[PDB]
């Protein structure tokens, strides 16, 4: 079980560290009405405009 968990941690950390597409917000997600949607949608918008393969 612990070895599986370590694999999970390594994958998550590599993703977070080598992530070029930084979506930034000045405030916490609970602040405005649809910050979570806006935040996912910023991710989608930058992936679309950069013309990445999805």
């Amino acid at each position: 079980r612990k070895l599986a968990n370590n694999v999970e941690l390594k994958v998550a950390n590599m993703a977070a560290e080598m992530g070029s597409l930084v979506i930034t917000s000045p405030d916490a997600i609970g602040t405005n009405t649809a910050d979570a949607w806006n935040f996912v949608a910023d991710a989608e918008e930058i992936m679309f405009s950069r013309e990445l393969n999805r």
């Binding site: 079980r1 612990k2 070895l3 370590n6």
Partner: protein
């Protein structure tokens, strides 16, 4: 369980650890009353007291 990384693990083998939790017992809960023989001629209050005790 703990895990470690690396090829060489000389003098780094851990041990085994099993924790324990104990359940115990409480005090008995009682319903105690008495009656005289002249009070058992009706016997209704006795049965109702048994029900209330449960």
């Amino acid at each position: 369980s703990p895990t470690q990384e690396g090829w060489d693990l000389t003098d780094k083998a851990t041990g085994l650890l099993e924790l324990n939790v104990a359940v115990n017992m409480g005090e008995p809960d009682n319903d105690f009353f008495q009656l005289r023989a002249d009070d058992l001629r009706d016997e209704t209050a006795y049965r109702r007291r048994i029900q209330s005790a449960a």
